[PDB]
Amino acid sequence: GTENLYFQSNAMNREQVEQLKQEYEEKGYCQIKKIFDFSAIKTIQKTLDQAYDLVKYDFVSSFIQEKLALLNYITGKNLMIMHNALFSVEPNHKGLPWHVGVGSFSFTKTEDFGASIWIPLDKITKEHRGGMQYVSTKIFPGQFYYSVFDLHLKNNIKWDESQGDLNEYVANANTIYNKITEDVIDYTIKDGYEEDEYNLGDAFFFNKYVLHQSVPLKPGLHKLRRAFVIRLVDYDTRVDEERLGLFSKYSQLHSRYYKTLPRYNKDSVLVMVSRAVQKGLKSPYLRDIPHVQQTLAARMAA
Amino acid sequence: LGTENLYFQSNAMNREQVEQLKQEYEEKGYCQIKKIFDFSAIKTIQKTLDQHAYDLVKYDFVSSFIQEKLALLNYITGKNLMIMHNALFSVEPNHKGLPWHVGVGSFSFTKTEDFGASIWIPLDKITKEHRGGMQYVSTKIFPGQFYYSVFDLHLKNNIKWDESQGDLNEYVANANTIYNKITEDVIDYTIKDGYEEDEYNLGDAFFFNKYVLHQSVPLKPGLHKLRRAFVIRLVDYDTRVDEERLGLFSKYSQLHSRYYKTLPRYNKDSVLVMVSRAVQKGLKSPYLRDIPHVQQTLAARMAA
């Protein structure tokens, strides 16, 4: 009786939903099977086949917006899309080692909420891994890592010409952050991480405290590994003005010395939030940043 | 001194100073408070020394001197403070102290995010030539709280130990844990010269929350015979017990007794022992205040 398809919702299995909420609460992350219709994936995938980096992929927003209610329920937050990034790269690719996204979320207060959706555009198989590994925050409460990173940033802006090459100074500084080498992290986590298989319309949801890494792709298929990565925050997530101060100050040292700008000026959310800040901020909330506020309803749940 | 005289003696802590201590505390997580104690009372205390575990309750006589000052400390910090333990520390002039640390250990029995703090009361004058005092770093320079999760990770790696992986004590010492990578040089490099070190007259004390990186300084042999100080540990009325960490302390403790037929050094802390027992007997609530041994002394442990 297709009479009632119109009055019915394409709803997710309520029991499964309850489980994702339990899982997210355990690990800080959950893999969401069939969060998207194949159709939708093919639409998005097909459209790709067809200051500006800020909005360049906003056509993804509407697909994401339909799911915020689910994610809001899962996390107990009131989520707000900040940025859609397309992350593609060749299969034999060396990525970053386990990390928490202290850069990705540099524009937010450490204690305030941040999270991501990793949306693979091409299937992820047990062969040809090519996806993502991740550690529960029960095992690795990634929050402390942010404080370590801040201590590092403050050390960075201690440099002066007298101390030789800037970048080298930074790479060689004896900072807690530099101490935590790849081996120390591998030793910490050991094998208590997960990696999963993803069919299209599957996504990985994880808050900013989840230590994680991308796995390289096997040549067989496909050509590249394509994924959307979507940064979210909560309705009450605040800016960190001091961190933004640190970056500006580092950006002066860098250009004054290499006559060029650090590559993080390529993070459009960072640039966007920094300008708003310098221009003076009535409010600590990201929601109150004029460009965010203007597009508010598009960034949030129905 | 006389009874009559009590009606005309004046304390003298200008509300200006008091308000300065509040600003310093809000800035650095610590403040040095001069003349917080009557020269007399220091003399009183010196004299007395000369004349559930015993250590847990041993120096309770000091609580009355402390308790008069909790209202001051409560105002400075914004907290409702509660005395937990009084301990004596004395050492010989040349002594190898422990390096920069934050007292994850001293306060291991509490939730990381919950309030903890200490009063260090030197029982001998600390002078610039002879030293033997403390160095400390603002929490704006080094925010200690992150060190707590490093410590927890290390404790967790400690219980992954197994007979096969060799000697227990060596394992812990050799583990490639973040905790083990944060060495004195890395700490030194992190704070550079951002620490203070003040001189103290009898009646002055140092106050600092559990996030302040700090360490004891050696004494020059000339001035004094020993380094005598009292360290009072205090917690907020709402400070909660960390049952998970204490669970970890237990598994780990069993590993030692099976292997070495003995217990780790951290069991020397009478407060940790006490809270652990209470946890084992079952907590009525997460609050330190609800532990019977605390509950019974509540008034004595808190401000006027």
Task: Please name each of the domains of chain B with its CATH number.
Answer: 1-304 (2.60.120.620)
The distance of A176 to chain B (nearest Cα, Å) reads 6
Interface probe, candidates B154, B190, B192, B242, chain A, greatest A C-beta count within 10 A: B190
Task: Provide the CA A263 distance to its chain's centre, in angstroms.
Answer: 17
Per-position b or e across A198-230, b if 16+ CB within 10 A of its CB: bebbbbbbbbbbbbbbbbbbeeeeeeebbbbeb
CB A147 within 8 A of CB B149: no
Interface probe, candidates B102, B138, B146, chain A, greatest A C-beta count within 10 A: B146
Resolution of the structure in the document, Å: 2.6
The verdict on whether residue A98 carries a ligand-binding annotation is: no
Please judge whether A144 and B149 are an interchain contact, meaning their C-beta atoms are less than 8 angstroms apart: yes
The verdict on whether residue A99 carries a ligand-binding annotation is: yes
Question: Containing H/E element for B77?
Answer: helix B70-77
The verdict on whether residue B289 carries a ligand-binding annotation is: no
For A172, residues 6+ apart whose C-beta sits below 8 A from its C-beta are A178
Q: For residue B110, what is the DSSP state?
A: B
For B165, residues 6+ apart whose C-beta sits below 8 A from its C-beta are B171
For B225, residues 6+ apart whose C-beta sits below 8 A from its C-beta are B93
Contacts of A188 in chain B (CB under 8 A): 153, 157, 177-178
CA distance B103 to A74: 36
CA distance A134 to A31: 11
CA distance B113 to A111: 12
The letter for the amino acid at B46 is Q
Collect all residues from B whose CB is shorter than 8 A from any CB in A: 142-143, 145-150, 153, 157, 175-178, 181-182, 185-186, 189-190
The candidate with the shortest Cα–Cα distance to A151, out of B142, B101, B144, is B142
Residue of chain A whose alpha carbon sits nearest to that of B182 = A176
Contacts of B149 in chain A (CB under 8 A): 141, 143-144
Contacts of B145 in chain A (CB under 8 A): 144, 147
Please tell me the number of Cα atoms within 13 Å of B231 on its side-chain side: 18
Q: For residue A287, what is the DSSP state?
A: G
Q: Residue A188 is nearest to which of B147, B153, B189, comparing CB atoms?
A: B153
Q: Give me the sign of the Cα torsion angle B172, B176, B177, B180.
A: positive
CA distance A171 to A238: 30
User: Angle at CA B6, nearest 5°, toward B3 and B7?
Assistant: 110
Residue of chain B whose alpha carbon sits nearest to that of A138 = B153
CA distance A177 to B135: 24
How far from A276 is each of A54, A285, B234, CA to CA, in Å?
14, 11, 43
Please tell me the number of Cα atoms within 13 Å of B263 on its side-chain side: 10
The verdict on whether residue A243 carries a ligand-binding annotation is: no
Interface probe, candidates B189, B192, B242, B245, chain A, greatest A C-beta count within 10 A: B189
Please tell me the number of Cα atoms within 13 Å of B266 on its side-chain side: 18
For residue B197, give the 3-state DSSP assignment. Answer: coil
Cα torsion A50, A52, A53, A59 to 10°: value is: -50
Please judge whether A188 and B143 are an interchain contact, meaning their C-beta atoms are less than 8 angstroms apart: no
The candidate with the shortest Cα–Cα distance to B140, out of A151, A153, A152, A249, is A151
The verdict on whether residue A225 carries a ligand-binding annotation is: yes
CA distance A83 to A106: 14
CA distance B74 to B91: 31
Please judge whether B181 and A179 are an interchain contact, meaning their C-beta atoms are less than 8 angstroms apart: yes
Interface probe, candidates B100, B140, B176, B187, chain A, greatest A C-beta count within 10 A: B176
The distance of A26 to chain B (nearest Cα, Å) reads 15
Q: Residue B186 is nearest to which of A143, A176, A187, comparing CB atoms?
A: A176
Contacts of B174 in chain A (CB under 8 A): none
Please judge whether A175 and B157 are an interchain contact, meaning their C-beta atoms are less than 8 angstroms apart: no
Residue of chain B whose alpha carbon sits nearest to that of A148 = B146
The candidate with the shortest Cα–Cα distance to A30, out of A145, A117, A123, A144, is A117
The letter for the amino acid at B300 is A
Q: Is B162 exposed, middle or buried (0-12, 13-18, 19+ CB in 10 A)?
A: exposed
Please judge whether A140 and B153 are an interchain contact, meaning their C-beta atoms are less than 8 angstroms apart: yes
Please judge whether A147 and B145 are an interchain contact, meaning their C-beta atoms are less than 8 angstroms apart: yes
Please judge whether A143 and B149 are an interchain contact, meaning their C-beta atoms are less than 8 angstroms apart: yes
Q: Residue A180 is nearest to which of B142, B157, B178, comparing CB atoms?
A: B178
DSSP strands (E only) in A23-139: 29-32, 79-89, 114-120, 132-134
Contacts of B190 in chain A (CB under 8 A): 151, 155, 175-176
Written as six digits, the tokens of A240 are: 């960190």
CB B54 within 8 A of CB B273: no
For residue A219, give the 3-state DSSP assignment. Answer: coil
Beginning with the edge strand found earlier in the chain, give each strand of the sheet holding A79-89 in spatial order.
A29-32, A203-207, A114-120, A225-234, A79-89
Region for residue B73 given its phi and psi (left: phi exceeds 0; alpha: psi -120 to 50; beta: otherwise): alpha
CB-CB neighbours of B91 under 10 Å: 16
Peptide bond into A128 cis (omega under 30): no
First-to-last alpha carbon distance for chain A, in angstroms, is 29
Contacts of A102 in chain B (CB under 8 A): none
CB-CB neighbours of B59 under 10 Å: 17
CA distance B122 to B133: 8
Interface probe, candidates B100, B140, B149, chain A, greatest A C-beta count within 10 A: B149
The label of the residue with tokens 């532990």 reads: B291
Contacts of B100 in chain A (CB under 8 A): none
